[PDB]
């Protein structure tokens, strides 16, 4: 399990522990006790403190956004879901799924094995029809998804959280092309984009974070396609909500964190419907 997947699960666990929790992930603590970096993340001036509060709030708001997306897909009758690079995401376990729902998780086999076994040791299994698809997304993943039972003729809700910023710009295009090729009319996708001008942020976040213990986007590319624009010319109707706009909407934006005035330092949450 990567460092990033642990950190964001730790954030969800931290949110969940509060009385005023925006989201509740009963499985996140379980999942980061059993790696050991959520001891550090569980443990961890104004700018520095504002950075830790931002990490927690951004993850809460992001989680709430994608949860709402899946919940609304369920309401709209969609019964096939795909979580791309599912990591430590516990949505297949914690969200309410109607009978007849299938939820595919695609990620590398060691990540999937860690999550399922860790959850088992705690007596946790899913109620919904959860299907693992062990493959790397930079490789030929569509046949793997199909062999797991995926029906391309059915409406799908796809999720790509915390992924694109860790993929080379050329990989992003190929990913979306494959998704389009597997998507029936009325399918949807929600994705967290890579920030428009956003490698610098991780460094002042790394620096502020490194003072908290005491006590990088290697693929950042100026030529990366804008996601909403790309989807809107490849068979989708796509719109974007900036992460700061979303954080403001629910009263969770702290303007005290460095680069607060730079909306380009933050992801957008793009939602799209297949035409």
C-alpha to C-alpha distances, 52 to 15, 176, 202, nearest whole angstrom: 12, 33, 13
Which of 136, 141, 82, 88 lies closest to 116 in space, CA to CA? 88
- Distance between CA atoms of 5 and 13, rounded to whole angstroms? 12
Q: Which two tokens stand for residue 131?
A: 């299907």
Q: What is the DSSP string of 6-40?
A: HHHHHHHHHHHTSTT-SS--TTHHHHHHTTSSTTH
For the chain, what's the residue count?
Answer: 275
Q: Does residue 106 sit in helix, strand or coil? A: strand
State the Rg of the chain over Cα: 18
- Annotated ligand binding at 173? The verdict is no
- Distance between CA atoms of 253 and 139, rounded to whole angstroms? 37
- Distance between CA atoms of 146 and 160, rounded to whole angstroms? 18
Residues 6 or more apart in contact with residue 4 via CB below 8 angstroms: 87, 162, 166
Q: How many CA atoms lie within 13 A of 164 on its CB side?
A: 27
Residues 6 or more apart in contact with residue 157 via CB below 8 angstroms: 69, 70, 73, 78, 80, 81, 82, 187, 188, 189, 190
Which of 216, 128, 209, 131 lies closest to 166 in space, CA to CA? 216
- Phi and psi angles of residue 129, each rounded to the nearest 5 degrees, phi first: -80, 90
- Annotated ligand binding at 107? The verdict is yes
Strands 236-242 and 188-192, sheet pairing: unpaired
Contact indicator for 61, 246 with CB cutoff of 8 Å: yes
Q: Which two tokens stand for residue 265?
A: 């330092």
- Phi and psi angles of residue 21, each rounded to the nearest 5 degrees, phi first: -50, 130
- Distance between CA atoms of 157 and 73, rounded to whole angstroms? 7
Environment class of 36 (CB within 10 Å of its CB; exposed 0-12, middle 13-18, buried 19+): exposed
C-alpha to C-alpha distances, 82 to 59, 91, 160, 181, nearest whole angstrom: 20, 11, 9, 14
- Distance between CA atoms of 28 and 80, rounded to whole angstroms? 24
Q: How far is CA 190 from the centre of its chain?
A: 9
Which of 153, 150, 53, 49 lies closest to 106 in space, CA to CA? 150
Q: How many CA atoms lie within 13 A of 39 on its CB side?
A: 5
Strands 268-274 and 188-192, sheet pairing: antiparallel
Q: What residues make up the domain containing 49?
A: 1-275
Other C-beta atoms closer than 10 Å to the C-beta of 183 total: 25
Strands 129-134 and 156-160, sheet pairing: unpaired
- Phi and psi angles of residue 83, each rounded to the nearest 5 degrees, phi first: -100, 115
Q: Which long-range contacts (CB under 8 A, 24 or more apart) does 223-229 make?
A: 223/169, 224/169, 224/172, 224/194, 225/169, 225/172, 225/173, 226/193, 226/196, 227/164, 227/172, 227/176, 227/191, 227/193, 227/268, 227/270, 228/268, 228/270, 228/272
In total, how many domains does the chain have? 1
- Phi and psi angles of residue 268, each rounded to the nearest 5 degrees, phi first: -110, 155
Environment class of 15 (CB within 10 Å of its CB; exposed 0-12, middle 13-18, buried 19+): buried
Q: Does residue 192 sit in helix, strand or coil? A: strand
- Distance between CA atoms of 256 and 24, rounded to whole angstroms? 26
- Phi and psi angles of residue 184, each rounded to the nearest 5 degrees, phi first: -70, 160
- Distance between CA atoms of 268 and 241, rounded to whole angstroms? 6
Residues 6 or more apart in contact with residue 257 via CB below 8 angstroms: 47, 50, 51, 54
Q: Which two tokens stand for residue 213?
A: 């213990």
| Measured CA angle at 247 (ends 104, 98), to 5 deg | 30
Which CATH number covers residue 8?
3.40.50.150
- Phi and psi angles of residue 22, each rounded to the nearest 5 degrees, phi first: -75, -35
């Amino acid at each position: 399990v990567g460092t990033t997947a642990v950190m964001v699960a730790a954030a969800r666990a931290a949110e969940t522990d509060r009385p005023d929790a925006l989201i509740r992930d009963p499985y996140a603590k379980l999942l980061v006790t059993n790696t050991g970096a959520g001891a550090l993340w569980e443990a961890m001036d104004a700018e520095a403190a504002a950075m830790v509060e931002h990490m927690r709030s951004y993850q809460a708001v992001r989680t709430n956004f994608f949860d709402t997306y899946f919940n609304n897909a369920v309401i709209d009758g969609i019964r096939q879901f795909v979580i791309l690079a599912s990591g430590l995401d516990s949505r297949a376990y914690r969200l309410d799924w109607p009978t007849g729902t299938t939820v595919y998780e695609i990620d590398q086999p060691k990540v999937l094995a860690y999550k399922s076994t860790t959850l088992a040791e705690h007596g946790v299994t899913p109620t919904a029809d959860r299907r693992e698809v062990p493959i790397d997304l930079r490789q030929d993943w569509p046949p793997a998804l199909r062999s797991a039972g995926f029906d391309p003729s059915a409406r799908t809700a796809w999720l790509a959280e915390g992924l694109l910023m860790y993929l080379p710009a050329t990989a992003q295009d190929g990913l979306f092309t494959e998704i389009g090729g597997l998507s029936a009319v009325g399918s949807r996708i929600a994705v967290e984009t890579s920030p428009l001008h956003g490698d610098e942020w991780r460094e002042q976040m790394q620096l502020r974070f490194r003072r908290v213990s005491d006590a990088e986007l290697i693929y950042h590319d100026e030529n990366r396609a804008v996601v909403a624009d790309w989807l809107n010319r490849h068979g989708w109707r796509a719109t974007a909500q900036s992460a700061p706009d979303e954080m403001r909407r629910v009263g969770r934006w702290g303007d005290g964190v460095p680069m607060a005035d730079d909306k380009d330092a933050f992801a957008e949450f793009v939602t799209a419907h297949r035409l």
